[PDB]
Amino acid sequence: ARAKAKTRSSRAGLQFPVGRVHRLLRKGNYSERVGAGAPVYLAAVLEYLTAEILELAGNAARDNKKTRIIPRHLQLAIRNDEELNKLLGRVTIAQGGVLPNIQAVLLPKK
């Protein structure tokens, strides 16, 4: 009888839950008060990050002729993208493996 409740995520055209982010911020022991636009901005930033990661992983999986993302595609994508590599150079992925590279002196004379 008041109004139809619209989610704050749909208000800003986002899929990530703005309310959940706001709750985590207020219960995350970060400050005694949190601004209104902070969760909206944070959700958009996280959405951009995960979208870039997902599109790179999908490109890798389609290059591997698979329709499901396994950790190998994520490892290859983030370690092939130079800047994502430095952003996530200090993290370890289970079942991710390493990258195919051979030192120049090790390969035969040919």
């Binding site: 190998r72 370890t92 289970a94 079942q95 390493v98 990258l99 195919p100 002196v105 090790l106 390969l107």
Partner: protein, 97 residues
């Protein structure tokens, strides 16, 4: 009879392992190792399968990183053979010793 000269089987198995993702350490001896490393702090601990898999993944990642760094050291030393001097040099440069 046929005989591969030393240097090609190594390269082919490097290629085979660099695309693989399975764990290179056997599960049972590693579980027995961690269960005895952890027993000197507290008696009769219990471990979850997820926890032991996490230990195995983390230690194998650390070892493969250490090996690629010490291989870099080996090429820098005008060699192709790993020797413990390179291991120690990498350990000390990375600030672990």
């Amino acid at each position: 009879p046929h005989r591969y000269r030393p240097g090609t089987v190594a390269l082919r198995e490097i290629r085979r392992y660099q695309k693989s993702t399975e764990l290179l350490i056997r599960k049972l001896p590693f579980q027995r190792l961690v269960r005895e490393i952890a027993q000197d702090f507290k008696t009769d601990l219990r471990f979850q399968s997820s926890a032991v898999m996490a230990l195995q993944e983390a230690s194998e990642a650390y070892l493969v990183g250490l090996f690629e760094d010490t291989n870099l050291s080996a090429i820098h030393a005008k060699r192709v053979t790993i020797m413990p001097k390179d291991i120690q040099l990498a350990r000390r440069i990375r600030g672990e010793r």
